[PDB]
Design a protein around this ligand. Structure first.
Ligand code: A1BFB
Ligand code: A1BFB
Length: 185
């Protein structure tokens, strides 16, 4: 791909984070803590899953960023509506306002309803996310494999401002403690 020139500097929004998450001082890295991180509750926080939003809101244009997923067993990445449900149980689907991919139990899937199997030959250590607001497109790229396409959502009905979306996943196994990291431009 040649989307690198739409690079945007994303930072994480602490106020949206699940109360177990630990966000770095530079707001570029997030990981699962082993306990509640001693923050007050608020209506923005994702309550049921280890999720957080980027601070940036996008309503037009073309945007690109990259995320490091090295040594994780489970995660989900993409964008979502600013208006997504924060409390209780929900599925990651375009009907619920999410355009995402995930790793779970040794398989990669796109967050459609029902979910779609992804075909990845080189397990990625870094993911590129491209959003074209006007075109209604969200695309995912395998940076480890020379930028190869992973998945494109087209005919997207955003229906609102978009925010970068992150899920570091649970760490029931003891093998998923590693952070998600926003990679430098
Ligand atoms: C068996 C799957 C459990 C699960 C694991 C995980 O890391 O993230 C999730 C995110 C979910 O997103 C929503 C709230 O729609 C739903 C379920 C999960
Ligand atoms: C890490 C995020 C994974 C996830 C998110 C979601 O919204 O729905 C799921 C549904 C799944 O199906 C089963 C077999 O439970 C499995 C995994 C997910």
């Amino acid at each position: 791909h040649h989307h690198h020139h739409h690079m945007v500097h994303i930072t994480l929004d602490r106020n949206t984070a699940n109360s177990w998450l630990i966000i770095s001082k530079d707001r570029r890295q997030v990981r699962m803590g082993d306990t509640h991180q001693n923050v007050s509750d608020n209506k923005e926080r994702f309550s049921n899953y280890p999720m957080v939003l980027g601070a940036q809101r996008f309503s037009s244009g073309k945007m690109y960023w990259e995320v490091d997923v090295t040594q994780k067993e489970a995660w989900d990445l993409g964008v979502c509506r600013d208006s997504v449900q924060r409390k209780g149980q929900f599925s990651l689907s375009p009907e619920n306002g999410f355009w995402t991919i995930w790793l779970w139990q040794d398989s990669y899937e796109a967050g459609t309803s029902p979910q779609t199997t992804l075909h990845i030959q080189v397990p990625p250590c870094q993911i590129g996310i491209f959003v074209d607001y006007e075109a209604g497109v969200v695309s995912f790229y395998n940076i480890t494999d020379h930028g190869s396409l992973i998945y494109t959502f087209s005919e997207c009905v955003f229906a609102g401002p978009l925010r970068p979306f992150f899920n570091v996943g649970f760490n029931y196994s003891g093998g998923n403690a590693a952070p998600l990291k926003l990679c430098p431009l």
